[PDB]
Amino acid sequence: GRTARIREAVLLAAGDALAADGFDALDLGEIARRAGVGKTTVYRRWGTPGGLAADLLADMAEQSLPRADTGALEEDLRANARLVVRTLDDPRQGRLFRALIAASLCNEQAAEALHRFYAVRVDEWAGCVRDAVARGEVPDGTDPHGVVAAVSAPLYYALLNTGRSLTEADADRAARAASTAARAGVWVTG
Amino acid sequence: GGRTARIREAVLLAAGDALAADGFDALDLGEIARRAGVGKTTVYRRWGTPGGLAADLLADMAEQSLPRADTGALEEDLRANARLVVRTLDDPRQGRLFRALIAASLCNEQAAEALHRFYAVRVDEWAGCVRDAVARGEVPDGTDPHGVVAAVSAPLYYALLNTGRSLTEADADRAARAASTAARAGVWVTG
Ligand SMILES: [Ca+2]
Ligand SMILES: [Ca+2]
Ligand SMILES: [Ca+2]
Ligand SMILES: [Ca+2]
Ligand SMILES: [Ca+2]
Ligand SMILES: [Ca+2]
Ligand SMILES: [Ca+2]
Ligand SMILES: [Ca+2]
Ligand SMILES: [Cl-]
Ligand SMILES: [Cl-]
Ligand SMILES: [Cl-]
């Protein structure tokens, strides 16, 4: 429909601008000009740069892809880690994710949406751990969220804290570390 | 030495207070000068920009970072580390300061280089624990100390920045236990 294709264009423009210039530069009147839509429409619908980032993160969460299902926990977590590395190492996507994390640190609306995005992604990949528990590969009571969060965590710590580039070897070690600890019962609750 | 050093101390204290209160976006060098009781021309001359002020604060934070635990056991060392990270990030002031410094790194290349240097200093210091654990035969030869130590802090930050979950002591203890278990199993042996 009309407003659906306008939203699509406005979100594309937002992702492009965030990747280019970061959250500090994101401006709704400019996104309106770039998307070719009335300034009033963009302000009315998204309100602020943080609302625009929030809705971009909503869209990203809604389109997040299903988990791998290989039959083995480590292979599943490796598929996960390698996709996160391919995403963060992409010139555009890596700059976009940095800008969206910056938005979350600057703006409470964007923070809520960023956390919801990671909740959706973790909860999807958590199905791998539920399958590993059912097949007896990891102990009963293993928290799926903790195991999955543990796979992405060192990839983001490299991105953001150490400032190192990520490699496929980093993805494999993130998955191997989490798998090893999960098998040993590290995330068995209580 | 002297008034120049006192001015830097005052300006950096003022910068930390402002970052923690109001964030990177809000930092203004003229306001910092007033808060620190220092002439504004000196503040703009010496630090230039909010990103330069953040970078120098991170330099001071790196220079002052505290020595590692040395308990005689890898997992107890990594647990001391993780508990300190959680106490820092869960502290109202310090947690806000660290979020603001990470925001500065994402927005400003000068602050980014300084941020990465800060984490390099902290990780390299705690890496001493892993080298001790190798020498005592607790983890295999060839274990990468950087990788093990980074692995401890990583899920704590991913809670802070990505999931938005509050951090607990139990989170610290699992972070240390996961990295220790993985390290003993040879996950960070280079090659
Ligand atoms: Ca612009
Ligand atoms: Ca404007
Ligand atoms: Ca703000
Ligand atoms: Ca704000
Ligand atoms: Ca699913
Ligand atoms: Ca204030
Ligand atoms: Ca020192
Ligand atoms: Ca020792
Ligand atoms: Cl993730
Ligand atoms: Cl300024
Ligand atoms: Cl750290």
Side-chain angles (χ1 to χ4, degrees), chain A residues 98 101-102 105-106 114-115 118 122 145 149 152-154 156-157 160-164 173 176-177 180-181 184-187, chain B residues 25 99 102-103 106-107 115-116 119 123 146 150 153-155 157-158 161-164 174 177-178 181-182 185-188:
Chain A
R98 284 177 191 93
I101 292 169
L105 292 170
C106 301
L114 187 104
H115 305 328
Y118 285 105
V122 171
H145 178 283
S152 291
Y156 280 95
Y157 184 86
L160 307 172
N161 298 76
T162 64
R164 298 176 21 210
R173 278 187 295 270
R176 188 184 161 195
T180 300
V186 170
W187 291 276
Chain B
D25 47 17
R99 277 171 273 236
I102 291 166
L106 292 172
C107 296
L115 188 101
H116 305 331
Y119 284 106
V123 166
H146 178 284
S153 286
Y157 281 94
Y158 182 85
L161 302 172
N162 304 72
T163 65
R174 279 186 297 268
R177 183 175 172 209
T181 298
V187 166
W188 289 281

Side-chain angles (χ1 to χ4, degrees), chain A residues 80 84 88 97 117-118 121-122 125 148-149 151-153 155-156, chain B residues 158 162:
Chain A
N80 179 22
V84 173
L88 296 181
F97 271 90
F117 167 82
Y118 285 105
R121 200 182 187 279
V122 171
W125 281 92
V148 169
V151 177
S152 291
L155 313 174
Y156 280 95
Chain B
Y158 182 85
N162 304 72

Side-chain angles (χ1 to χ4, degrees), chain B residues 74-95:
Chain B
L74 184 64
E75 191 184 338
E76 289 180 28
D77 282 354
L78 299 185
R79 178 181 312 121
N81 180 28
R83 282 181 180 197
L84 279 169
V85 174
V86 170
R87 279 179 52 230
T88 301
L89 303 182
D90 184 60
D91 179 63
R93 177 189 201 278
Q94 294 309 107

Side-chain angles (χ1 to χ4, degrees), chain A residues 12 15-16 18-20 60 81-100 155-156 159 164-168:
Chain A
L12 175 67
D16 287 351
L18 283 166
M60 284 164 61
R82 288 186 177 192
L83 175 63
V84 173
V85 165
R86 278 199 299 280
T87 305
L88 296 181
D89 191 62
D90 189 59
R92 179 186 191 274
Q93 298 310 97
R95 289 195 295 271
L96 179 53
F97 271 90
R98 284 177 191 93
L100 286 166
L155 313 174
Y156 280 95
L159 185 74
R164 298 176 21 210
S165 297
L166 295 169
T167 64
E168 192 177 70

Side-chain angles (χ1 to χ4, degrees), chain A residues 160-163, chain B residues 8 50-63 98 101-102 104-106 108-122:
Chain A
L160 307 172
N161 298 76
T162 64
Chain B
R8 173 167 181 264
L53 183 43
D56 197 33
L57 178 63
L58 282 161
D60 185 62
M61 288 167 63
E63 192 176 3
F98 277 91
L101 285 170
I102 291 166
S105 74
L106 292 172
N108 177 275
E109 293 179 41
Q110 186 165 12
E113 185 268 358
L115 188 101
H116 305 331
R117 177 174 306 284
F118 169 81
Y119 284 106
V121 163
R122 199 185 184 274

